[PDB]
Design a binder for this molecule. Sequence first.
Ligand SMILES: *[C@@H]1O[C@H](CO)[C@@H](O[C@@H]2O[C@H](CO)[C@@H](O)[C@H](O)[C@H]2NC(C)=O)[C@H](O)[C@H]1NC(C)=O
Ligand SMILES: *[C@@H]1O[C@H](CO)[C@@H](O)[C@H](O)[C@H]1NC(C)=O
Ligand SMILES: *[C@@H]1O[C@H](CO)[C@@H](O)[C@H](O)[C@H]1NC(C)=O
Length: 149
Amino acid sequence: GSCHIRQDYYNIQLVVEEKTGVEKRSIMGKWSVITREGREPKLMEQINIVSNNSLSETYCYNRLNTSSWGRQPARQRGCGQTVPYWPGDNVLEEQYYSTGYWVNATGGCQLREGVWLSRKGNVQCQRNGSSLILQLAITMEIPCDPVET
Ligand SMILES: *[C@@H]1O[C@H](CO)[C@@H](O[C@@H]2O[C@H](CO)[C@@H](O)[C@H](O)[C@H]2NC(C)=O)[C@H](O)[C@H]1NC(C)=O
Ligand SMILES: *[C@@H]1O[C@H](CO)[C@@H](O)[C@H](O)[C@H]1NC(C)=O
Ligand SMILES: *[C@@H]1O[C@H](CO)[C@@H](O)[C@H](O)[C@H]1NC(C)=O
């Protein structure tokens, strides 16, 4: 994925174990939470590179299958929409965990069976005040609440 070298202003404080998902306070690990100035925190993989004719490190927002973590995200996003996680949701393109980081996930934009998070979809609804648009496959449960209060 997108890679960026560590800058001296980065204050890396959180590492996550790839398979187990254990979070620990540390400055250094294979998967670390990186917050580039202004940007959302992201879990990034340390990768070996050649840069300016020398061996080095960089950090890349690479895909990570979080199934073995055995814990759910607080939000997910895919196909240009970000939604709260509701139990029953499928894995989307990225997952946000409550300690505070996005993970590049292994899913897509199918939120439930036959229900896609699609900006050009046919159903508008909300989850906890957050607006979303769904595309439904051809009864069908709508996994969200009406916009009317
Ligand atoms: C999640 O990570 C994957 C790689 O693990 C990213 O996919 C690659 O993105 C780069 C550009 O950044 C392309 O050159 C590659 O062809 C893509 N595929 C692979 C298999 O490497 C993906 O873009 C990342 N997703 C997000 C949302 O950042
Ligand atoms: C992620 O891992 C789980 C457990 O091994 C597996 O069932 C699932 O298919 C994996 N997802 C992808 C996209 O490989
Ligand atoms: C979001 O809404 C659902 C259903 O309306 C509810 O079950 C859930 O507790 C809400 N979550 C929060 C954080 O309010």
